[PDB]
Amino acid sequence: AYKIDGNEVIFTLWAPYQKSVKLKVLEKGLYEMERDEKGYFTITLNNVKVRDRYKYVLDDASEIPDPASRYQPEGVHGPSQIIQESKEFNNETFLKKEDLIIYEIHVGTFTPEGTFEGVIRKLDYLKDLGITAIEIMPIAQFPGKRDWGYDGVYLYAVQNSYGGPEGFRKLVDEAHKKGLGVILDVVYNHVGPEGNYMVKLGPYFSQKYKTPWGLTFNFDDAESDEVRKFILENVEYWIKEYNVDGFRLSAVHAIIDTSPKHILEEIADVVHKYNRIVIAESDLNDPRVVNPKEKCGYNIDAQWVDDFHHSIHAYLTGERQGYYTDFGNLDDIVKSYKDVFVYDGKYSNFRRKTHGEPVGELDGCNFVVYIQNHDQVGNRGKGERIIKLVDRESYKIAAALYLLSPYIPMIFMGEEYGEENPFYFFSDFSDSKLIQGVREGRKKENGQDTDPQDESTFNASKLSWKIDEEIFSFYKILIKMRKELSIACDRRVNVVNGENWLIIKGREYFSLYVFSKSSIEVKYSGTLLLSSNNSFPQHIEEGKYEFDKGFALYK
Numbered sequence: 405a406y407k408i409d410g411n412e413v414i415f416t417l418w419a420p421y422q423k424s425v426k427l428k429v430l431e432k433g434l435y436e437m438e439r440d441e442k443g444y445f446t447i448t449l450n451n452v453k454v455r456d457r458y459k460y461v462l463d464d465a466s467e468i469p470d471p472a473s474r475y476q477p478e479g480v481h482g483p484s485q486i487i488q489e490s491k492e493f494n495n496e497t498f499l500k501k502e503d504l505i506i507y508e509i510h511v512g513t514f515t516p517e518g519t520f521e522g523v524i525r526k527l528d529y530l531k532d533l534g535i536t537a538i539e540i541m542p543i544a545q546f547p548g549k550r551d552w553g554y555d556g557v558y559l560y561a562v563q564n565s566y567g568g569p570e571g572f573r574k575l576v577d578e579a580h581k582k583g584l585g586v587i588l589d590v591v592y593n594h595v596g597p598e599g600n601y602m603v604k605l606g607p608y609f610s611q612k613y614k615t616p617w618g619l620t621f622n623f624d625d626a627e628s629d630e631v632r633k634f635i636l637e638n639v640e641y642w643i644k645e646y647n648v649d650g651f652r653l654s655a656v657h658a659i660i661d662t663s664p665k666h667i668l669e670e671i672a673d674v675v676h677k678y679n680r681i682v683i684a685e686s687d688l689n690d691p692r693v694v695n696p697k698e699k700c701g702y703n704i705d706a707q708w709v710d711d712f713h714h715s716i717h718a719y720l721t722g723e724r725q726g727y728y729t730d731f732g733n734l735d736d737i738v739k740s741y742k743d744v745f746v747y748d749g750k751y752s753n754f755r756r757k758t759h760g761e762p763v764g765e766l767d768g769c770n771f772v773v774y775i776q777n778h779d780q781v782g783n784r785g786k787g788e789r790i791i792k793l794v795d796r797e798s799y800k801i802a803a804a805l806y807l808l809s810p811y812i813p814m815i816f817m818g819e820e821y822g823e824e825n826p827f828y829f830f831s832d833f834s835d836s837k838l839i840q841g842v843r844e845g846r847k848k849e850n851g852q853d854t855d856p857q858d859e860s861t862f863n864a865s866k867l868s869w870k871i872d873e874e875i876f877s878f879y880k881i882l883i884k885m886r887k888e889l890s891i892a893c894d895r896r897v898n899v900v901n902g903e904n905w906l907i908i909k910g911r912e913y914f915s916l917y918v919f920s921k922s923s924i925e926v927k928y929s930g931t932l933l934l935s936s937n938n939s940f941p942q943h944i945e946e947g948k949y950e951f952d953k954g955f956a957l958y959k
């Protein structure tokens with residue numbers, strides 16, 4: 405994009421497809437740019453200040469925003485803007501992976517405001533709940549106001565309608581004062597379908613394959629050095645310019661790289677260079693994502709493990725559609741509890757292939773688990789939260805299973821107080837083809853009948869903030885007991901199961917998960933820390949008990 409250099413500013417556009425490019429500074433001038441042989445265009449200017457707006461005009465005289473824009477005040481087709489530029493950052497995150505309890509937030513819907521300011525207003529509540537890091541869904545500028553974020557199209561530009569650069573920086577600074585970390589969801593596997601102008605510039609995109617969401621970045625073919633650079637500088641930029649704590653990488657199985665060093669390893673190298681954390685959403689069931697270099701891995705800090713969610717959801721709801729077909733047994737939950745992946749190199753009927761690989765001795769803090777998140781709610785056609793799909797006891801049992809697991813737990817916004825509103829897929833394109841495409845694709849892929857482009861679809865997805873006190877208090881105590889029992893990262897657990905029950909015993913605790921009234925042989929003693937109802941004894945000893953449906957934590 406641009407580099408401020410005392411009182412001058414250098415503009416750089418990578419555009420090998422283009423014979424000649426002009427810098428257009430709105431209400432100032434047009435300036436010819438110098439071309440190097442790799443196709444970078446440069447010009448250094450003296451008359452540019454903060455708030456100045458610009459575009460680049462191409463060979464065919466067409467005008468485009470800066471692909472590396474730091475701010476798009478008028479959206480994805482408007483001009484780019486020069487910004488404030490406080491390059492101020494801590495050399496370390498204070499976040500410790502082992503203490504991580506994550507809370508996923510969609511900014512537009514989290515709060516009536518729908519902005520960063522709205523999330524600042526909730527920091528005290530979040531802190532008090534006991535979360536240690538917030539995970540922000542993508543903020544790279546996308547079309548309109550209503551989008552999950554995965555249609556982001558300007559990787560360095562903070563969404564205008566969320567409050568732009570200033571709002572986000574204020575959010576992170578305020579989060580830090582309250583002792584909360586911020587994790588940014590970033591998308592390096594594709595670009596959204598409206599408002600991306602990189603195709604006219606050079607081979608940003610791979611000819612080699614496609615994601616379900618668009619063409620993917622070119623990391624390993626002709627001219628890919630510069631595209632690797634575009635992505636790697638983006639990770640550096642979020643750290644230095646916004647003092648962000650870490651990242652959640654969208655769909656790393658869709659980032660394909662046959663280079664000698666995988667771009668995923670380089671991504672982690674940048675984040676580790678600045679002592680930050682990265683988490684990968686990976687559908688590979690392959691420890692290489694998370695293995696250290698010495699074990700041939702990319703050394704990413706942790707990965708999402710859908711198998712854990714899927715085990716719990718399928719078993720508790722009886723659902724078997726789509727990917728749930730691969731799950732549904734109690735055994736699947738115990739397998740994920742013991743071995744992390746259910747598919748650790750076993751035939752998948754859903755995938756029609758052998759899937760995954762065992763994880764070895766990696767500790768629990770290489771993985772993140774959840775009973776809810778924006779996908780497991782929002783990719784449902786009716787967008788239902790799991791609260792609508794199981795009874796109250798099972799909801800509490802589910803919450804306990806993940807929050808007391810050895811893995812890093814992630815809470816979906818609202819889950820903790822028993823939110824009941826759906827979370828739908830919504831979008832805000834203005835290109836009529838994409839408007840028709842999204843409705844038709846989403847109806848077909850997801851069975852979504854609400855219109856993604858209809859504002860009511862977004863309004864309906866806003867949190868109500870209607871507190872179920874009994875559920876909220878139950879979450880708070882879970883989170884606190886997790887910390888006090890040193891549950892985190894520790895995979896040394898013993899698991900016994902019968903038909904309709906599970907007992908899980910760690911170093912300092914044991915839990916009873918009674919799915920259905922059962923006579924159970926309890927091999928341990930302890931004192932009761934928390935229970936989902938009042939039927940469990942305060943002190944229990946070794947013996948046989950007939951329990952009603954519920955959950956209890958001892959010791």
Ligand SMILES: OC[C@H]1O[C@H](O[C@H]2[C@H](O)[C@@H](O)[C@@H](O[C@H]3[C@H](O)[C@@H](O)[C@@H](O)O[C@@H]3CO)O[C@@H]2CO)[C@H](O)[C@@H](O)[C@@H]1O
Pocket residue numbers: 552554555591597616617618653654655685778779783829831841842843845
């Ligand atoms: O018509 C817009 C777009 O819709 C569909 O793509 C969306 C997916 O339906 C939706 O699930 C979401 O997918 C992202 C996940 O939510 C997220 O966790 C991440 O890891 O990766 C996914 C892609 O980034 O968002 C996409 C994009 O909006 C449809 O498949 C597309 O063809 C269509 O372009």
